[PDB]
């Protein structure tokens, strides 16, 4: 129980090509929802040398100027000069989007329980567009109720971005990676064994001002003091040689290729779905959000120390084929009872999720980097079902 | 031990736009490696209406005709007529690939333990190209030593492909999905609560002939009769209405958007890496394969009923930052002992992995669908270190 | 003069890939200016296997959904099934347009005579966007006041299109070409020495039924019996073997690669400008139309049998650097007097042209095939300046 | 014959996006012909912001790396920096080439006179791939036997390129235009009325140093002093305001959109065909070259002062449907006699042309700018048929 295990998780900055594609997809989604709140979006972004390629499907009654939005989006993460390896003013923007206003195409189609079963229930009205598997997780290791490794990695990359943006370390460029290996004595994290920060930078800086500055201004700020131990914690700063060129020129970036960074950083299983570029009617996003919501409410209410909520949807069906609650020996009550408690407290049907979390708003661009979970100001991070859960449990 | 839990997993056929992208990427990899086995590949495929768009990076002394290869590849999976929604003969094939002759670029750069630590060890020479987190899994629930739900799902989609290909059900078209919800009594699978198959077909056929044909020719054959139980198991065939148009026309397909389908179907955590389009020097692929190799060998050797092997790599480093073996109370020995045994039996450095499995061969197209694991004839599915493990165990 | 000359001219149908690109480009222009009358468009279309690629520059406060417009446009010229080699439903549509409101960008900046000379004349305010040389032609050999060879070619391809569209020859497909070689009495045509018609067709029909059908339903209708001479006029029908596959699949199509077909078919010099995809502020288009307008009016007023009008523009300048009129010995008056008469009757400044012909209307899609000149219902084909020219002449 | 007329012609520099597309196309053609001399090439290039798009069809089995070749080609023309808006290193290169080896597809198919007529003549064996109309021109106004205005225009843009490339005027950027209006006293050019140079430049230089530098180093070097008259010749330098922003970023460039600049600058009719990206079996190129060859030989032989040679081809036919020679009252013999003399001296069949001019060599890149005609060292500029013509004439 006191045994020692090494647990590793990682994050990338907003300037990473994969994350840049995610941000582009979600920026598109946000603009569309800003003009039309029932807009249906599946936007995929490919990012590569000299090029942004946006493809996918859109159903809306608004119009967004996509190329300008894309260039705007590329500018926000910092690719504004050619020397950085990518430049919003001079790169090509390619569009292959099937855009339909809902008069053409159709409205969202009828669920199985409406069409084959003949249900009059209005919350049954929207079925899952696709087959899906979703996992939500919460644990009291951290104040945000998140696993610590992904939390620390996210803080590292987030801070790495902010020291660049505020001008404190102006030699920094957008691309970046951070990795954290934490020592766990059973379920309790003790300290960080290894921190790795890879930061894109101008050749003006040399490795030792780079290392000292990143350790002092990024690592020690981003990682709580208790977990950093001098002489035992190993700090690796750009261990791969120098990192002058980064972003799209170096590598091809795609929407939905950072789904573990997006979620729990390898602490728990994942269902395979990607978040960005998808409107809330895609259960891949909304049901995962709802799963995080359920798990976080369950843990915050004191019914568990660790909770994993699994949702699964059959295509065309509003109601989940499976709902499960897992407490790895941490539950106040048996897991099955916790499961039924959850079934009565929560409503995992798509329309119900959308209404309960108020998902039809342009709120998704900030999720595009640094994780969808563990951050304040998101609907699925509000623990407002605590007392309902506590009363149902007793 | 007595309580009942629902476990859901799913698969897609080779005709799925995501999986089609995967197959294109791996076909490119196979073709390149056939002519040059020191070839370095990161090929990403976007698939959409009328278009295959291939981007990424390629180092070779070989030449592969990408459009001809793409069209051949689209043909194999069955998209040969416009009516199916995609057609190998008439679609556009776009290329944006940075192709490297090793004359330009360089050889792979020196690892951290070579450059910074001063290792003369040749197995230390190649470092992880990128930071990574990898999970390998095995369990004795099934003969393939894989979790049952993903196994059943894979068998469903695989066979759904084969009845189409043999002409047995000649109205079938390439796209398809299968989902399985299995009832678990704790650790033991009992029976399938729900089977869902969505199959693409010509509209000449209607759903009750479809239901009868798919239930008898796909479900009861692909799933062993013990897990099919009369009166309790529900069969859903095309619950989403009908499936006439499928593949790229309906949806955009991207490389590496089926990573859970590729692996364990949600039984265990995932590290986020995609397999297809990447040569074995990318640890995201080769180390995941190797982790599977270790776990499968450990379980097959009788040291555990279930084994999870975790590998993690720091960028530029040959040696893993974490290596862990977890048996969920199933180990013959304590997990630390099993870990030490694993470290003595296995060598998880990148060069060592490539050499131990001889991964530099054109063997990767068949991995593109129906799972990278649980299938015979792949180097990482060979349990040939069983007796070494048994000797180390005692 | 009694000596015999061979004069050849040719045309293509609306289904030719070059002409398809022209039509796509002009359709975009029409849709944009329909919404905004000062919208600035330079739209270039590339057409190839499975792909329509739209690039160029757009300046507007309107929105046009390019992919649906492209698909509708492709449907109109007849590419509706894969069998034809191109299909509106299944092809890829790519967009790489710099689209700007004048929100950034600007209205056209001030002309040279406004900025450097200080002209207060509002018709002087818009200068030529580019350096240019323009030719307009008219001749009384045909009723449309056009050179006969190009006229007969246009009539041929137009009729081939018409027998295809009405169902008279239902095996015909969109692509087609026609060539005419005429025997000349120095200057006036006697008869057609050779007619060549290449028509795309289903492989069900064969060449002697194709030959009879095309000669009787296309050639003899489109060419007046006066010019067809038994025993001397040679009919070549598909001399290249069968024409099953056509359009974008056989050949790559680009905007502005049929400029001689667009104009006079080689009777007179050309300045190099393309028409399609350009709004009327591009003098390459508007000044050429206007040149045709002047020449046609000059011939219709009886001042000449043949008239060639030369315009030349310096970049940034509203007023043409040269205006010249040529009657190849056919003028009632000396060529200089015709020139000064024209200078008094006509105003070839860009804004002046636009207002005089009312060019800011969605009138350009029908111009994309079968010639910009020689057809009724176009502003520049209106002979409403006849009486003014006649009074100036006397 | 004695009247005074203004004759205007124009040119663009190699950095003009249209001309850059031409150069890329021909660079592709040249590399292919270097590896395979029977290579069949139809390469079309689109050039725009952040993008070079190469499409078309190639039948060869040598191999050329298109992106590398494209970037080299963009570099030589001077686009090496982001501030120019376009850069060989950072732009995306897209390929949609219907590549083929002649094992698949076929060898060139049989000409009409082989397949339908039964000719054993080997020079009849290759027919025209498409219908075509070609014009060749020569006149003794200049030593090169070219019309003077386009000659001067070409010399201007060429010199504007060289003063930039060599560093003489280091503030210059690649894009540029030149126009010349020449005073003709009937047949004889007398002097240049107007020269307009529009040159792309950095904003550090302003208009009066630009004007003096271009007039002194470009205009006066490029135009012989005989045609320049101080006090009557007007020099306009960048009359359209500043020209800081240029190239592909300002305007979209396409292959074959400068065909009049390529040829005779508006002196004579044109057939509509484009040259660049096409191998010698395309009569659009080879027959135009051969027509220039014939005309130049006729003029150089003293048979005429000015000669216009028209060729026309029916699709699938080796032998021209029309051949015409016109001397505008300048012929020693009547134009007819000149025409048949031309028919016996020359052989305008495609294969004969290819052999007579030795066209199967990588010689086409230099033609991509500054005119295909009037330049030394080109096969079609060689006057080696003079004495044969003189003897046939007597």
UniProtKB/Swiss-Prot annotation, chains A, B, C, D:
Pathway(s) of this molecule: Amino-acid biosynthesis; S-adenosyl-L-methionine biosynthesis; S-adenosyl-L-methionine from L-methionine: step 1/1
UniProt GO BP: one-carbon metabolic process; S-adenosylmethionine biosynthetic process
Entry binding sites for Mg(2+): 18
Gene Ontology MF terms: ATP binding; magnesium ion binding; methionine adenosyltransferase activity
Region Flexible loop: start-end pairs: 100-110
Residues that bind L-methionine: 57, 100, 251, 282
Substrates-to-products reaction catalysed: L-methionine + ATP + H2O = S-adenosyl-L-methionine + phosphate + diphosphate
Protein EC: 2.5.1.6
Record GO cellular component, one term: cytoplasm
Protein residues bound to K(+): 44
Subcellular location: Cytoplasm
Subunit comment: Homotetramer; dimer of dimers.
Name used for this protein in its record: S-adenosylmethionine synthase
The organism of origin for this protein: Thermus thermophilus (strain ATCC BAA-163 / DSM 7039 / HB27)
Lineage: Bacteria, Thermotogati, Deinococcota, Deinococci, Thermales
């Amino acid at each position: 129980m006191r045994a020692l295990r090494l647990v590793t998780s990682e994050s990338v900055t907003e300037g990473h090509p994969d994350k840049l594609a995610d941000r582009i997809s979600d920026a598109i989604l946000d603009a569309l929802i800003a003009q039309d709140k029932k807009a249906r979006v599946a936007a995929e972004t490919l990012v590569t040398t000299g090029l942004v390629f946006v493809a996918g499907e859109i159903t809306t009654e608004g119009y967004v100027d996509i190329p300008n939005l894309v260039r705007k989006t590329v500018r926000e993460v910092g690719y504004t000069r050619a020397k950085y390896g990518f430049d919003a003013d001079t790169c090509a923007v390619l569009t292959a989007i099937d855009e339909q206003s809902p008069d053409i195409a159709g409205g969202v189609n009828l669920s199985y329980e409406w069409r084959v079963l003949k249900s009059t229930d209005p919350l049954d009205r929207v079925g899952a567009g696709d087959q899906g598997l979703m996992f939500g997780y919460a644990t009291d290791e951290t104040p945000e109720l998140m696993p610590l490794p992904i939390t620390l990695a996210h803080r590292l990359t987030m801070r790495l971005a902010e020291v660049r943006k505020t001008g404190l370390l102006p030699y920094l460029r957008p691309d970046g990676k951070a990795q954290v290996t934490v020592v766990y004595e059973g379920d309790k994290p003790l300290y960080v064994k290894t921190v790795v920060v890879s930061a894109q930078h101008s050749p003006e800086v040399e490795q030792e001002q780079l290392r000292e500055d990143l350790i002092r201004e990024v690592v020690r700020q981003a990682i709580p003091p208790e977990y950093l131990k001098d002489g035992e914690t190993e700090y690796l700063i750009n261990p791969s040689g120098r990192f002058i060129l980064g972003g799209p020129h170096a590598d091809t970036g795609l929407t939905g290729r950072k789904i573990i960074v997006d979620t729990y950083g390898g602490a728990v299983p994942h269902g395979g779905g990607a978040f960005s570029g998808k409107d809330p009617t895609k259960v891949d996003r909304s049901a995962s959000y709802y799963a995080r919501y359920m798990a976080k409410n369950i843990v915050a209410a004191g019914l568990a120390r660790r909770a994993l909520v699994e949702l699964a949807y059959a295509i065309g069906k509003a109601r989940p084929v499976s709902l499960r609650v897992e407490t790895f020996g941490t539950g106040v009550l048996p897991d099955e009872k916790l499961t039924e408690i959850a079934k009565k407290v929560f409503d995992p049907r798509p329309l119900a999720i959308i209404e309960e979390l108020d998902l039809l708003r342009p709120i998704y661009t900030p999720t595009s980097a640094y994780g969808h979970f563990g951050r304040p100001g998101f609907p699925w991070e509000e623990t407002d079902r605590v007392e309902a859960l506590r009363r149902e449990a007793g």
